[PDB]
Amino acid sequence: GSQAPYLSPAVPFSGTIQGGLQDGLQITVNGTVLSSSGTRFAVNFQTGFSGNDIAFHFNPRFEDGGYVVCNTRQNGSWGPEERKTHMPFQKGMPFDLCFLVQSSDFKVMVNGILFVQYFHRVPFHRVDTISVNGSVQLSYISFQHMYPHPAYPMPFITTILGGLYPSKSILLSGTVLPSAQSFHINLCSGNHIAFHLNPRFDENAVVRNTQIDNSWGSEERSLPRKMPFVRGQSFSVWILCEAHCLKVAVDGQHLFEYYHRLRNLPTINRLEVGGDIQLTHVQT
Ligand SMILES: OC[C@H]1O[C@@H](O[C@H]2[C@H](O)[C@@H](O)[C@@H](O)O[C@@H]2CO)[C@H](O)[C@@H](O)[C@H]1O
Ligand SMILES: OC[C@H]1O[C@@H](O[C@H]2[C@H](O)[C@@H](O)[C@H](O)O[C@@H]2CO)[C@H](O)[C@@H](O)[C@H]1O
Ligand SMILES: [Zn+2]
């Protein structure tokens, strides 16, 4: 069983990794590097919340042409720095950063490409905390016990085992096709669509509705700001189920609430994704 994800955690952030790091554990970080608020950010796998002991410090730096520093801190002492002289991140752009823990190292992938392989210097069992600081904003941090990035056929239909309930979250990472017209995300119950999320680029709107016995209800189109999705750009979306409504955020920014119309939450046990996007991650 994998622990629940951290949704839109505020930076600086520090959170427990339930059960500590384990061989086969994959930690996914979806966020966006700030456009004009600093020149570096870091993701740390550490022991406790002090910072004196960081088993793995992943530090992208938008300095001197861009590079990334990897190191370990033990009892306040930094070890030999391991640097990658190329920068896979971009200011103002969302990213998919995944850490795969293995017996001898951390496999670090950025937007689907293996970027760094960091051999353990400190026993990975001693890591019980993940922290994030710097010029970055977070959408979510998820956990999954293990392909790190499998191919998702479109449309993608999958079962939400156990269905919905208060505190249940659904996560999605993908990319809007450059030529995208629209795409949708449905949470279904039998022959009904409990929740329909439909971003439309041509209409420049994000439509939400419910379909009962093939009949659509009142459309909800409210948005706190401009269209959050961009053509050709990667994105992340999380849907949090509460007793009275669903809360939806895109790239870490709350977009809206959608009060339940179909109330038997456990029956909402199917997720369907279709349209003009490519999927990267899905957690149900
Ligand atoms: O409410 C979601 C469904 O909308 C349908 O289109 C609506 C359209 O949004 C509205 O402006 C009006 O023209 O009525 C249409 C038909 O109901 C979509 O066709 C359907 O796929 C859902 O997205
Ligand atoms: O090594 C990780 C650690 O680096 C510190 O900065 C280093 C710097 O990278 C190096 O070139 C210089 O010789 O020493 C500095 C201090 O050790 C950062 O300050 C720290 O936050 C970590 O990123
Ligand atoms: Zn990933």
Same domain, 103 and 166: no
Residue 99 tokens read as 């850490």
For this entry, resolution in Å reads: 2.0
Sequence-distant (6+) residues with CB within 8 A of 90 are 33
Structure tokens at 1: 């069983």
Domain final residue, candidates 118, 143, 168? 143
Shared-domain flag, residues 203 and 158: yes
124 by DSSP, 3-state: which?
helix
Residue 119 carries which side chain, given as an amino acid letter? F
Chain CA centroid to CA 183, Å: 19
- Tell the burial category of 126 from Cβ atoms under 10 Å away from its Cβ (0-12, 13-18, 19+): middle
Environment class of 197 (CB within 10 Å of its CB; exposed 0-12, middle 13-18, buried 19+):
buried
CATH number at residue 173: 2.60.120.200
Amino acid in position 284: T
Q: Is the domain of 230 the same as that of 108?
A: no
Contact between 34 and 92 under an 8 Å Cβ cutoff? The reply is: yes
Cβ of 198 less than 6 Å from ligand 1:
yes
Omega prior to 12 cis, within 30 of 0: yes
Q: Which ligand is nearest to the CA of 220?
A: 1
DSSP of the chain: -PPPPEESPPSSEEEE-TT---TTEEEEEEEEE-SSS-SBEEEEEESSSSSS-EEEEEEEE-STT-EEEEEEEETTEE---EEESS----TT-EEEEEEEE-SSEEEEEETTEEEEEEE-SS-GGG--EEEEEESEEEEEEEEEE---S----SSEEEE-TT---TT-EEEEEEEE-TT--BEEEEEEETTEEEEEEEEETTTTEEEEEEEETTEE---B---SSS----TT-EEEEEEEE-SSEEEEEETTEEEEEEE-SS--GGG--EEEEEESEEEEEEE-
**211 touches 192 (CB < 8 A):** yes
Name the experiment that determined this structure.
X-ray
**Domain limit, last residue, from 87, 109, 143:** 143
Of all residues in the chain, what percent are helix, strand and coil, respectively (each to 5)? 0, 55, 45
Bridge partners, residue 182, by sequence: 200
Number of domains composing the chain: 2
Positions at the binding site for a beta-D-galactoside: 44, 57, 61, 71, 78-84, 196, 200, 210, 216-222
Ligand 1 within 6 A of 207 CB?
yes
Which of the listed residues 68, 78, 118 should we mutate to test ligand 2's pocket, taking the one with most ligand atoms within 8 A of CB? 78
Nearest CA-CA partner of 87 in 102, 97, 100: 97
Which of 206, 216, 218, 209 lies closest to 254, judged by CA? 206
Give the position of tokens 């353990």.
120
CA–CA dist 157, 152 (Å, integer): 10
Nearest CA to ligand 2 atom 2: 71
Residue 60: both structure tokens together: 């992208």
Indicate if 31 and 168 belong to the same structural domain. Answer: no
Q: Which two tokens stand for residue 39?
A: 């020149």
Distance of CA 211 from the midpoint of ligand 3 (Å): 32
Instruction: Give the position, in ligand 1's atom list, of the atom nearest the Cα of 219.
Output: 1
Pocket test for ligand 1, best of 187, 207, 215 (most atoms within 8 A of CB): 207
Q: What is the CA radius of gyration of the chain?
A: 20
* Residue showing tokens 């979806």: 30
Centroid of ligand 2 to alpha carbon of 70 (angstroms): 10
Residue-range definition of the domain harbouring residue 20: 1-143
Distance, in Å, from the CA atom of 227 to the CA atom of 90, rounded to the nearest integer, reads 21
CA distance 98 to 107: 8
CA gap 279, 185 in Å, rounded? 12
- Nearest Cα to Cα of residue 115 among 142, 91, 85: 85
First to last CA, the chain: 13
Measured CA to CA in angstroms, residue 198 lies from 141, 174, 187, 195, 220 at distances of 24, 15, 12, 10, 10
Write the CB contacts of 151 (distance below 8 Å, at least 6 apart in sequence).
Answer: none
- The residue from 109, 143, 177 where one domain ends is 143
CA of 219 to the centre of ligand 1 (A): 8
Pocket of ligand 2 (CB under 6 A): 57, 59, 69, 71, 78, 81
Among 186, 140, 164, 165, CA closest to 281: 140
Please work out, in degrees rounded to the nearest 5, the angle formed at the alpha carbon of residue 96 by the alpha carbons of 23 and 109.
45
Residues 77 and 160 in one domain: no
CA distance 69 to 80: 10
Question: Is the peptide bond between 155 and the residue preceding it cis, with omega within 30 degrees of 0?
Answer: yes
Tell whether 108 and 137 lie within a shared domain.
Answer: yes
- 3-state secondary structure at position 264: coil
Check whether residue 136 and residue 159 sit in a common domain.
Answer: no
Q: How far is the CA of 119 from the centre of ligand 3 (A)?
A: 20
